[PDB]
RNA sequence: UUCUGGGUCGGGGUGUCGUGCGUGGCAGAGCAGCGCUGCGAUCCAUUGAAAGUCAGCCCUCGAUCCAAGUUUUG
RNA sequence: UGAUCCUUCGAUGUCGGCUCUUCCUAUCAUUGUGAAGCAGAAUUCACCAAGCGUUGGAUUGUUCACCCACUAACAGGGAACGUGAGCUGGGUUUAGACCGUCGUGAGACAGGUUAGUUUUACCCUACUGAUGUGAGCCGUUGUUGCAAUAGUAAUCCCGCUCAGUACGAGAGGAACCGCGGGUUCAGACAUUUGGUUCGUGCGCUUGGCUGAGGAGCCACUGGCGCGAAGCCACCAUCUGCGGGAUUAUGACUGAACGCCUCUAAGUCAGAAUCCCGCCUAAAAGCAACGAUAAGCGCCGUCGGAUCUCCGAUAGGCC
RNA sequence: UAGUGACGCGCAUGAAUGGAUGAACGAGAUUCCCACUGUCCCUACCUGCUAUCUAGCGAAACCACAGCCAAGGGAACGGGC
RNA sequence: GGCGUGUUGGAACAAGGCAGAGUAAGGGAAGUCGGCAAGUCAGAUCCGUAACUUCGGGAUAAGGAUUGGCUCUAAGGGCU
RNA sequence: UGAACUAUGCCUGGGCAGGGCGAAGCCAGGGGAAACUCUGGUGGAGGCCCGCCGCGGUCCUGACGUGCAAAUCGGUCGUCC
RNA sequence: UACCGAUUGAGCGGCUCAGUGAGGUCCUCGGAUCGCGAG
């Protein structure tokens, strides 16, 4: 089970949908929304619902 | 050998080389293997050997038809272990008709169903991802 | 004069007419060969397609790439209460073809088995059966009934069982009941009559019939779509943009002569709703419905040797369209005809299974139960909870 | 067409988008009046909040209703 | 391609391509075999055989050619030189115009070039689906089935092992069984990935409008990002099968013809063919079984007698 | 077999029946390249107006009689023989 | 200021059409007689613009950057 | 017998947003020994350019094709001192 | 031996437009951790 590169979140065999680039770096995204907001140069931690968003508020 | 995946590269197709050959296209013309439907385009994946021409590149590679082999595509093919993996860049590497490279090294990953046809393509592989 | 480049037909002339199908349940049309040496036992059976999930298995097959490796096999889950068995029926062979001999059904017969008797239950006296159930209480038709058990032992060599679903125990609101004569194909004729005796008005499980890791048939009415075009119905290549009066369509239907068009020219009708039959459909898991082991409700039956959770084959918030499978389910590998909640008739398989794909063993490592209402991200709702922490609901 | 049964709302689950109105702040490029007050895109807390979710999603048994009678058949 | 001029000039739309179906075999490949100047590999000749497949492209309006790659092979044809109320008009084949040659000229060209309206189905069959129909009625109505007959579907390749073995002086170099995938095709399916999204679902946003905030509307769906459910793609996934008589051919026994002989009598092995199973449909074809409303049958084939119809037949189910 | 630059005993080019050239210009003819795109590989989904059903209203072309086929003969391609 | 959607209403959302110049994975003219069709580009500001030429042009050549909202600053007037 | 359509001419009236490149002439500042030159601004020329109404009618060989119409409709397109 | 020559001829170098921009250095605040302070 690995972890989502956007989200944080745990991405199942069976879901998801990874991504390799030229430099060698392979990302694991969980839908389709966290890849086209990865793809789009968002950032997790200004994107409100990332888990990386609420460790950096400390939401939990 | 290989099991099936999503072909996303018909012919007609300029992938980027991907070696030290001198070449930075490759306009795919066919592919090997391929019996051939009426009207259906002769696509290609991974791991494939294609017939490609260099349309950039150094003037003694761009004028000829060279084997080349499909190292990465952009069309997302699904693994028997539930993975859609999918490269940034559709990429190919010059080789002969025994699958032996024409260069020494390769720019960026080579995808795993290519490597393990190739036993010469995954000899010279930086990643294997 | 003859076509320029060579080109296969379009769609297979083995399953005209592309008809709506005039039988809403699937039909046995050919029940597996007898052979009287081995025990009695049941040939078919009615499921219900609750819907698809995939699984996660490791695959041992020498020499294979994915030996000793885990795989994600889509799957679809169909749920198979016990069948009650109301009738035995027998068959006389003639030279003009199988003929039923006579038929006996049971004394007590369910109310939900008597509504498929009749088109307009609420307003209809439910008396079917009435006069039929008086023979196993009278002396004297009880003498008429030994009589007829006794004939079917001499004069019949195919035997059956008329068996009805417990759809009281389903999510759909359909009350009514599928009967199915199930062909016992166990042993002598006297040995079946007396096996289809004692089982009357008796239950059967799915656990008895099939079994693990076994192939079988999956008879079954597919999804309609309507009227379609030639281009949806038999796939044909649509015509260029500016094409005159259409480009959805089949350019030329015919030669001039013959003067006529041939039934094997691809033209517009209904497509979808057909009957069809799909073998060698691997069974992956036979689960257990819910029961109360020690007071409590068990949902075990999505567990496994390698995940050993407590979620069931339910996902969040059950089945899309469905609802929620609390009976004896049967996971089958890969597609299955037909809509959610349609009724399917399993079989077993008439060929001989003994390729390395057949009589392979299967070993589930991990079931999947995310929520298929969109992209769900959660097995469980206590994980869900977990994960997320307490919400405002609280 | 009353061992009851069937609808309409509501509740819960699920999933979609993404942190609502209001209120509070010595957060805020600054700026204008007499430390204070006003103007001010945005930011922060309340707030993974708000909204909508079967009409062809899932489960309730909470609320309140409903039970009549077209045509014809030996 | 001619020859002819029988049919058609009160009109049979005419070249090629596209599309789609079917047939033929004078067989390119695959299945089963025979032959060699068949060692193997490759190839050639021939036989049963049309089940199945026979490609993507550059140039040309072109059929026809030529080349580039792929491939088991990229075989040859017919069906009004298949197919314009199916399409496309590129060509030819009205009127405009240019050139070349020819003519004093108007004009000609079977020479080149450019622009040039492609009309109508609602009728009858055929076909594709969709209601329904034997009506003679103690039959009406329902469930579970049987089956005539018709359709019929699978195809081909590669990798591993056999094996660097048989074979060959070498160079080279197979095959069966088994295993793992794929090509083409067929039938489905939406868990997953991808497409669509006017649940106009949620956020945002441009111009304008309601005095402003809030909440919203208008611009034939204002625009953008994400997106449920459905539907959908070799752009995701799943499934695709067994016998029988035999053809070519190779043989057994055994005469004719003291021998010999696969044939004359009698037998055996035998295939992508054929037939059937599997699968799809279900008949002016049918069975088992449930219930059948003073009203509605039977009983007592005795009807004791009355009326109406419709066939025959004129001792026999030996 | 296209386009362009050259070659010219040119069937049948050629000098106001005007030759050669030409910046700018062109809803003129033609070729290649970059970008772009469902033209295509290979189709799928949504929407508006129709088709569809219904109340009202309500035509026309056309028509020897008509309308299931195979083969035969025949005015040498029948629907009827 | 004018009007009831242009010689009719209601119920459905099948095929097939016309239109919205609807949208699209990967490839990008392999389609086709032919980039037919529509797709990209598009305003404005600041930069930068060849071959050729009748010196007028070519030229918006080509090729880049910037653009919202908000709070300020600076410069450009008249009259007594 | 017709120029109520259309072709050409004459008389007398009417009409043609908003922008772009920007010619002669002129002013000023620099270079010169004279011949005369260079920069900025001004000026607003043209069968000039983008383009609305107008006026035309390319392409889709689109819609329509017993039509709204015995020649029309939509997008696109030519021109607009 | 040089020259003209369609072939947007081809190759190899120098300096640069624009975009992307690794890594230091400073500046704002960030506090794993340690005994108000060091970090
Ligand atoms: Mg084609
Ligand atoms: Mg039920
Ligand atoms: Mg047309
Ligand atoms: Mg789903
Ligand atoms: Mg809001
Ligand atoms: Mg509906
Ligand atoms: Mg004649
Ligand atoms: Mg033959
Ligand atoms: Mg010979
Ligand atoms: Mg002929
Ligand atoms: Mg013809
Ligand atoms: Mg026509
Ligand atoms: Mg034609
Ligand atoms: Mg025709
Ligand atoms: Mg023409
Ligand atoms: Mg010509
Ligand atoms: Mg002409
Ligand atoms: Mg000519
Ligand atoms: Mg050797
Ligand atoms: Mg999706
Ligand atoms: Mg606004
Ligand atoms: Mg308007
Ligand atoms: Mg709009
Ligand atoms: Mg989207
Ligand atoms: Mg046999
Ligand atoms: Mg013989
Ligand atoms: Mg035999
Ligand atoms: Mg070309
Ligand atoms: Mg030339
Ligand atoms: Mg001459
Ligand atoms: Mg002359
Ligand atoms: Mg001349
Ligand atoms: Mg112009
Ligand atoms: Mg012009
Ligand atoms: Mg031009
Ligand atoms: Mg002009
Ligand atoms: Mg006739
Ligand atoms: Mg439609
Ligand atoms: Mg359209
Ligand atoms: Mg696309
Ligand atoms: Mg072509
Ligand atoms: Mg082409
Ligand atoms: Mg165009
Ligand atoms: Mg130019
Ligand atoms: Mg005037
Ligand atoms: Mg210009
Ligand atoms: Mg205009
Ligand atoms: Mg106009
Ligand atoms: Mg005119
Ligand atoms: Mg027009
Ligand atoms: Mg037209
Ligand atoms: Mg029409």
């Known amino acids: ?60 | 050998a290989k099991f099936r995946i999503s072909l996303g590269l018909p012919v007609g197709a300029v992938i980027n080389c991907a070696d030290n050959t001198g070449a930075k296209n490759l306009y795919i013309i066919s592919v090997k293997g391929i019996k051939g439907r009426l009207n259906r385009l002769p696509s290609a994946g991974v791991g494939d050997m294609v017939m490609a021409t260099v349309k950039k590149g150094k003037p003694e590679l761009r004028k000829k038809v060279h084997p080349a082999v499909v190292i990465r595509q952009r069309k997302s093919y699904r693994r028997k272990d539930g993975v859609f993996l999918y490269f940034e860049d559709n990429a190919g590497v010059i080789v002969n008709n025994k699958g032996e490279m024409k260069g020494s090294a390769i720019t960026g990953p080579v995808a795993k169903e290519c490597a393990d046809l190739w036993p010469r393509i995954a000899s010279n592989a930086g990643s294997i991802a | ?394």
């Open chain 1, 1 to 60: 089970v690995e972890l989502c590169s956007f989200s944080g979140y745990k991405i199942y065999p069976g879901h998801g949908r990874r991504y390799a680039r030229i430099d060698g770096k392979v990302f694991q995204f969980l839908n389709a929304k966290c890849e086209s907001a990865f793809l789009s140069k968002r950032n997790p931690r200004q994107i409100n619902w990332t888990v990386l968003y609420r460790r950096k508020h400390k939401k939990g």
């Open chain 3, 1 to 394: 004069s003859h076509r320029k480049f060579s080109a296969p037909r379009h769609g297979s002339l083995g399953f005209l007419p592309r008809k709506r199908c005039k039988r809403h349940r699937g039909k046995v049309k050919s029940f597996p060969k007898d052979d009287p040496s081995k025990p009695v036992h049941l040939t078919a059976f009615l499921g219900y397609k609750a819907g698809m999930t995939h699984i996660v298995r490791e695959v041992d097959r020498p020499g294979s790439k994915v030996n000793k490796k885990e795989v994600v096999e889509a799957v679809t889950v169909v749920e198979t209460p016990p069948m009650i068995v109301v009738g035995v029926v027998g068959y006389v062979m003639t030279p003009r073809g199988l003929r039923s001999f006579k038929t006996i059904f049971a004394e007590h017969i369910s109310d939900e088995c008597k509504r498929r008797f009749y088109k307009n239950w609420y307003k209809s006296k439910k008396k079917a059966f009435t006069k039929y159930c008086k023979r196993w209480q009278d002396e004297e038709g009880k003498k008429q009934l030994e009589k007829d058990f006794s004939s079917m032992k001499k004069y019949c060599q195919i035997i059956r069982i008329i068996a009805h679903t417990q759809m009281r125990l389903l999510p759909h609101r359909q009350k009514k009941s599928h009967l199915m004569e199930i062909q016992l194909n166990g042993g002598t004729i006297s040995d079946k009559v007396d096996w289809a005796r004692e089982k009357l008005e008796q239950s059967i499980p799915i656990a008895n019939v099939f079994s693990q890791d076994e192939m079988i048939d999956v008879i079954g009415v597919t999804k309609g779509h309507g009227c379609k075009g030639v281009t949806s119905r038999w796939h044909t290549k649509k015509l260029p943009r500016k094409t005159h009066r259409g480009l959805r369509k089949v350019a030329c239907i015919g030669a001039w002569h013959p003067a006529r068009v041939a039934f094997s020219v691809a033209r517009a009708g209904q497509k979808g709703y057909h009957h069809r039959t799909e073998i060698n459909k691997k069974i992956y898991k036979i689960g257990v419905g819910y029961h109360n082991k020690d007071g409590k409700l068990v949902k075990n039956n999505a567990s496994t040797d390698y995940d050993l959770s407590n979620k069931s084959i339910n996902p969040l918030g059950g089945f899309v369209h469905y609802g929620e499978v609390t009976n004896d389910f049967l996971m089958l590998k890969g597609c299955v005809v037909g809509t959610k909640k349609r009724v399917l008739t399993l079989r077993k398989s008439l060929l001989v299974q003994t390729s390395r794909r057949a009589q392979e063993k299967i070993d589930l490592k991990f079931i999947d139960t995310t929520s298929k209402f969109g992209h769900g991200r959660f097995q469980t709702i206590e994980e869900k909870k977990n994960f997320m922490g307490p919400l405002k609901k609280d």
